[PDB]
Amino acid sequence: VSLQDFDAERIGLFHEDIKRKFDELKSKNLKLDLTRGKPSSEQLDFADELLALPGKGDFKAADGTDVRNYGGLDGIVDIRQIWADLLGVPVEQVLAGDASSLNIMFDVISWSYIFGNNDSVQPWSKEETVKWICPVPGYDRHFSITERFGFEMISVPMNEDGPDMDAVEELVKNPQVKGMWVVPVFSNPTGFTVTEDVAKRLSAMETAAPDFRVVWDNAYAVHTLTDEFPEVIDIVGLGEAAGNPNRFWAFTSTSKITLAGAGVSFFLTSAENRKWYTGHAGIRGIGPNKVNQLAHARYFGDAEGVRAVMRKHAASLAPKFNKVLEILDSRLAEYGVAQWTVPAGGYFISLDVVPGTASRVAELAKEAGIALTGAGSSYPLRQDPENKNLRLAPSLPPVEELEVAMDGVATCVLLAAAEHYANL
Amino acid sequence: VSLQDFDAERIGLFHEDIKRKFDELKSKNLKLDLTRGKPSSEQLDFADELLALPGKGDFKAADGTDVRNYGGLDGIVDIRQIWADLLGVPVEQVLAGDASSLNIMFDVISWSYIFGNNDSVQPWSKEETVKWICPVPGYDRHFSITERFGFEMISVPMNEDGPDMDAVEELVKNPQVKGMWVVPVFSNPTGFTVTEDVAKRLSAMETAAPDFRVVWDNAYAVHTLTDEFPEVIDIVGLGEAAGNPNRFWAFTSTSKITLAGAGVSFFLTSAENRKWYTGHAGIRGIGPNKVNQLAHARYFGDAEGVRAVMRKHAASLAPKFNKVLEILDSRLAEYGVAQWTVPAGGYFISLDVVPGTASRVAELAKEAGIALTGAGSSYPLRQDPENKNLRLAPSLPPVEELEVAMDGVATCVLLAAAEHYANL
Ligand SMILES: Cc1ncc(COP(=O)(O)O)c(C=O)c1O
Ligand SMILES: Cc1ncc(COP(=O)(O)O)c(C=O)c1O
């Protein structure tokens, strides 16, 4: 019997039962935080050597470029080739920037708004209405960019194999629709991964806008919890093969590989998109930081060197995800109140509680000294229409803290569920 | 006797002789370049240690921030404080960014265009016409930004004490005029420096636009050629004292102090302007590269350490400027065909030749294998109405190449002038 099928008296009693546990949880006086989707100090220690790279006397890229001096908008060949080899794409596709791929995403959107993109009839700022496809649950920092530009964000379900392509293929037939966000591998926060079939559908679909763009933000391209690395779909190539070469603006970075905020970002896109981008970037400045790019190239040496680092991250993160999953199972399984993802990579676990209770869960956790990301945080304008989803971030705390914190979260899920069904 | 005073016969003899020298110059098959204000490899060698900084295990800012991990939009206190001490301003004024000040100048104009600034009644995108004041000769990369945005650029003289304030003060009465560029110390390319009197006038003037900004791009704030450091006017503080606290967006950077394109940029402005800036920068991303900021704080240690570096730069650069000036004196002075700046600091000499001939001098030079910046490059839209100005960049080449290159340039000046007088 799930809680929802408890009779009126049984759920009342269950409510009194679980409230005793909640009282015990509060008497612990916890101060714990499950909100931070960032690497732990242990993981940042792996790149300690990078703090001393590229090192005295070592300032030449593989083509002879003095990385210390001005110029070059594309990034240095050394780091571009490593990433091309890692991702299995032609090097010509790859541009290497500064330390933030979000910065580049914002820029390409803002330039499409101001100037138009290379396929635009006119700039997006001339449109009465710009709409933007948002697979949910998704990444708050993506949705914040589109919200700040005033675009009407239209949600679609993020499914196990990627965004619901029936819904997307329909929505893009509206010319107001100028693009879409997706995190295609270990998606933030669902852990779901776009299949080859879904990528093909995104690549071949017809859009009403001539200048429609998919942001393919492959932020977790190599970020496995296991020994297996996920497939890297050459999405820019798929767009080229389908006859929509300019469709995909693809990104990734080293922020959860080396240093979070001081890594190197990459922008992968078609020939025509890259000329558009560097023509605007060349007015914004002289070009990106080549020294940090050479530092990175030296640290990794080659693509296998990147995978070797990712195995260290996996070994550090795996027990943390395991603890969270173990606790959710032991406390909640029997009750039919919640569903959670079981990801094989990325930085998050996505938890769905009783619809109408996610805000209450986060409130109860807060009264108990446990910080959860708020209800709706993974949705545009922070509006989850079912008030059910919560994001869990296991990476930073030690396992002992995760155990305590999740045990408390589970109690909160149960109490909120008991309140909800008792009030019905 | 000046060349203009030669009679037909004497200018005909002079013309044949200088033409012969020019032919002799072309026969050398030179490949020399006086176009880019890039530090030499000798100057870049000074920061060899920075390639190893901040070094293994050293990753905490002075307030405890782990610089390896996400967050913080303002830059770290370590570098902000050093720059504050260097410039004699309160640390609260200073924001520290990534490796390009141009990126930030671009960004604040683009955001004023898109969103409006904090004093705007509406975005500049909604204006029929945006005008922008451009002291000339000035910096080509500034003008490119406002050209790219479609702003109508209105020229005013850059005089020895700064922009023509009688002209500026009149132009700013037009509400179409939204801002102005200035390089206020050792200006690119005149070497001129804004006086306290001119600064005060800029701070007190009445503008018809409520959201007018001066870009005070102090790229050469400490960039002495003589080891005497120029005055640092606290321009933000002067706007605050005059009752126009939001007027100034001030910038500087370490691109010509440490590593050109891998240094640290600074944005100095009022509390309300900083809040507006970081509000938008926080949507564009999670914040700047804190590791490079700590590397720079470790490299310099303090304000005096910055000043010691600048003295090394002066020792490297001063004999290159001196050689250029010696050649201009010995080849051109007697003929009354040219005038040039004699800068106490900065990266350039500004050369004015016979009006109507600058484009010809640059074409002659290019035929002879000597790259000069084109005619008009220090003017908006590359439009020098007198076709007389050329910019010379002595920093990159060794003195021996400067000698050869400048002797050639002088022969080009004289041939162009001889053609001009003979054609009358
Ligand atoms: C999907 C996604 N993209 C981008 C980022 C940030 O990347 P960067 O640090 O290169 O801006 C994150 C950080 O969590 C993320 O989850
Ligand atoms: C006036 C001026 N501003 C800004 C810059 C460069 O700024 P950054 O390298 O910090 O973009 C230069 C480069 O010399 C310059 O002459």
Residue numbers in the entry:
A (entry chain A), B (entry chain B): 4 to 427
Give verbatim lines from the article:
Aspartate aminotransferase (AspAT) catalyzes the reaction from L-glutamate and oxaloacetate to L-aspartate and α-ketoglutarate. AspAT utilizes pyridoxal 5’-phosphate (PLP, Vitamin B6) as a cofactor and is the most extensively studied PLP-dependent enzyme. Among the five classes, AspAT proteins belong to class I AT that is further divided into 2 subcategories, subgroup Ia and Ib. In this study, we report a crystal structure of AspAT from Corynebacterium glutamicum ATCC13032 (CgAspAT) in complex with a PLP and citrate molecule.
In order to elucidate the molecular mechanism of CgAspAT, we determined the crystal structure of the protein at 2.0 Å. There were two CgAspAT molecules in each asymmetric unit, which form a homodimer of the protein. Dimerization is mainly mediated through the contact between the core domains of the two subunits with three α-helices (α6, α8, and α12) of one molecule in contact with the corresponding α-helices of the other molecule. Since we observed the electron density for the PLP cofactor in our structure without adding it in the crystallization process, we speculate that the PLP cofactor binds strongly to CgAspAT. Unlike the binding of the phosphate moiety in other AspAT enzymes, where side chains of arginine, threonine, and one or two serine residues are involved, the moiety of CgAspAT was stabilized by the side chains of one tyrosine (Tyr73) and four serine residues (Ser103, Ser104, Ser256, and Ser258) through a hydrogen bond network. Near the aldehyde group of the bound PLP, we observed the conserved Lys259 residue. Because the citrate molecule is stabilized by hydrogen bonds with the highly positively-charged residues such as Arg39, Lys41, Arg144 and Arg394, binding of the citrate molecule seems to mimic the substrate binding of CgAspAT. However, in CgAspAT, the N-terminal region is positioned away from the core domain and is not involved in the formation of the substrate binding-site. However, CgAspAT shows only 10~15% amino acid sequence similarity with AspATs from subgroup Ia and subgroup Ib and exhibits unique structural features not only in the auxiliary domain but also at the catalytic and substrate binding sites.
